Amino acid sequence: KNNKSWMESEFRVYSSANNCTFEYVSQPFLMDLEGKQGNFKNLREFVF
Amino acid sequence: NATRFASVYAWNRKRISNCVADYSVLYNSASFSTFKCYGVSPTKLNDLC
């Protein structure tokens, strides 16, 4: 309701975490989840 | 620089990953009481890892 930003709030994927061997934080990116209409306006291509 | 450690059987292990440690001030500065090395010189830990 206040300051949307569409940021992640709760993490429901995994309940607990332990024995962490690695952690990293990448560069800040911009994401807007607001609903849109029409053809797909963006393309994201990742190779891991 | 920690204020209080744990017991000798309770010893805590600090996990250091994706970091850079300066070993020159830990040894060449001679700010501690004593140190002893095994298999590697204290001055060789800068170029080795």
**DSSP string computed for chain B:** --S----SSS-------S-----HHHHTT--SS----SSS-TTSTTT--
3-state secondary structure of A12: coil
Give the integer Cα–Cα distance in Å for A6 and A4.
5
In chain B, the residue whose alpha carbon lies closest to the alpha carbon of A24 is B18
Contact B18/A21, CB-based, under 8 Å? no
Residue labelled with tokens 């709760």: A10
Asked if the Cβ–Cβ distance from A24 to B18 is below 8 Å, we say yes
Instruction: Look at residues B30, B27, B29 and name the one whose alpha carbon lies nearest to residue B41.
Output: B27
* Structure's resolution in angstroms: 3.5
Q: Locate all alpha helices (DSSP H) within chain B, ordered by sequence.
A: 24-27
> Closest by alpha carbon to A31, among A23, A42, A21?
A42
Residue with tokens 């017991």: B7
Alpha-carbon span A8 to A36, nearest angstrom: 19
What are the structure tokens assigned to A27, written together? Answer: 């560069």
Distance from CA of B16 to the nearest CA of A (A): 10
Which residues make Cβ contacts (< 8 Å) with residue B38, sequence separation at least 6? none
Q: Do residues B27 and B35 touch, judged by C-beta distance below 8 A?
A: yes
Alpha-carbon distance A36 to nearest alpha carbon in chain B (angstroms): 40
